[PDB]
Amino acid sequence: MRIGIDKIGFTSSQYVLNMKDLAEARGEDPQKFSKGLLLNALSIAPITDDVVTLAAGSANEILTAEDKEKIDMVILATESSVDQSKAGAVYVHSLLGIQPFARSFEMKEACYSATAALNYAKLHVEKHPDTRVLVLASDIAKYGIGTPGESTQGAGSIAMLVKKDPRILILHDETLAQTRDIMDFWRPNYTTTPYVNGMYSTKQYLDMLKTTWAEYQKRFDVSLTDFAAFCFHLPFPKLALKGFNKIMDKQVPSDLQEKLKVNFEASILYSKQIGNIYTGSLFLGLLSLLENSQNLVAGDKIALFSYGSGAVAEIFTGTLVKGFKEQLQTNRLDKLKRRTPLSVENYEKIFFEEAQLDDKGNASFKEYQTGPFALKEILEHQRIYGKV
Template sequence: MKIGIDKIGFATAQYVLNMDDLAESRNVDPDKYSKGLLLNNLSITPVNDDIVTLGASAAESILSEEDKNTIDMIIVATESSVDQSKAASTYIHSLLGIQPFARSIEMKEACYGATAALDYARLHVQKHPESKVLVIASDVARYGVNTPGEPTQGAGSVAMLISKDPRILLLNDNSVAQTRDIMDFWRPNYSTTPYVNGIYSTKQYLDMLKTTWAEFQKRFNTSLADFSAFCFHLPFPKLALKGFNKVMDKNLPEDFKEKLKENFESTILYSKEVGNIYTGSLYLGLLSLLENSKNLVAGDQIALFSYGSGAVAEIFSATLVDGFKDMLQTNRLETLKNRIRLSVEDYEKLFFEEAAIDSEGNANIPEYKTGAFTLKEIHEHQRIYGKVNDK
């Protein structure tokens, strides 16, 4: 049975921080961000925009009423959960009006969680061919002011509809995963921001890429020559570039190496404007590739490297199907230009503002601009979401 991604959508915050502005405020050379990280802008969420609103907006942009009546599983992958018990997918299920007899869960393993969700979704459709599974990777990457991680923040959500006979790409039946018990990036329950060992994490990312890729090639008797593109997890685009250089086969013909390089450049276009979206970063890279590559055709194979600190990595592959371009958007970069540009002072106020909860667990939420959905209030410790402009 052919199973894969039938539709894919994206949503991000309505506010943006320019990296040159941040560099000037932090007294660093702008090249440190523009060339050292390959970043231009970061999406910034206000207090009424979170993984639920972003995830619902991303899914709403692609789902038909027929989809909502057929979906029988919603999986949200995140490391920015709004509740230690209740899954974000239950809120999204309600906001989207998906039929009631559906399973809703949340998955976590740092930035790897969405890949685990895809694996689960594919197995579910394999067992229940008429089912559709909505997989949402939704995160707000948040670090402290003037910390090393600050320029690698961001926010966004990628929604993918998994079904049989997909119209974008097939998920191939080949993958290799690897686990290491390491402390390169983590966030204890008592901390609102993560702890990061940046240099160590970079080394682990690249070493797990190298060793997992070697095992993948050995198990499936394949090589880079069999793929038209390679997508990477994108905590920041420069790290993905290092990964691309690590897997590059110097023995490939020059024209083929150039094709791979062109397609790699297509994978990072959106991340350069949005920043880090944790679980969705790999899939934002995939979306960026599909919507911006000039040479991909049906039948092309794409390799994907997923990485989540802690750490779990997986390499798998997908095949483009006939008509995939008809399912994509062509003006997304232009749309990103419509975000509201923040001063650094406004960014610090907006991004780190928290709901002021009173003794009864109530809070009025400021009405900042969001996508289709917003956090309206907190009432008796319960988060109340709704469509924008709905009373």
């Protein structure tokens, strides 16, 4: 029984901050961003485009009426939640008109949780092969003005439809996760922006990659040469490049070294324009890879390294399905160029806007550019979402 990713949708916000503009405002060498981080631009979200609206937009990209009839589980992976009790998935379920007899909930573990969502989705469909599962990985990476992380901000959501006989990627059962209790990045309840030790996080990302991959190879009798591409979590592309270099070695034959490198470069193309999207970043890289590699074919295997701060890592794999290109888009870079560039001044005002509640819990918002769904208002503490 083949189970996996049938369709992948992606939505980002409608605004962009160009890194050269941020560099100019902050007195930074623009090459720190273009070469140091390997970032060109970041998506910026207004207050009316949040985890829920981005998630619903990404699903709207891919779902058919038949999907909506057969989906019986909706999982939102996020670290950008807008309620402490109500899962953002419930809103997505509603906004998309999915059939009522579904379970809907959120998963949380920094940038890692969509990997667990996908795994549960896969097992659920295997048990109930007539069903489909919608996994959303939606986040707004917001670090704060003047912080080291300001340059690794971003916004977006990946939607993945999981079902039997998938048209893109068959998911396999050989997985390995690792948990280690650390404080590289975290976000207490009283702050909209995380605390982060960037250098320590990089070191831990690389050590969990090294140790998890070593153990994976041992348990499952595989090596680098079994794969046509390796995808990494993508908070910024330089970190993923460090990961790639960390696990690669020169015992790989030269032709495969070249292929893996070209595929790595394909995988970071979108992230260079979008920035960090937390839970969705690994999967955005997968999408970028599939839409930009010139060498991937049916039957090629892909290895994926998921990381979340705090920290949890997992390696898993999949095999490409004949016809996968039919499910992809060719003009995504063109669509990203449509985003409205913001001055640093306007980015500061828009990205860091917070709701101004009256004593009854009402808040109103200016109309900003969004995708198909928007936060319209807050009405007596209820976030009101609708189609635009």
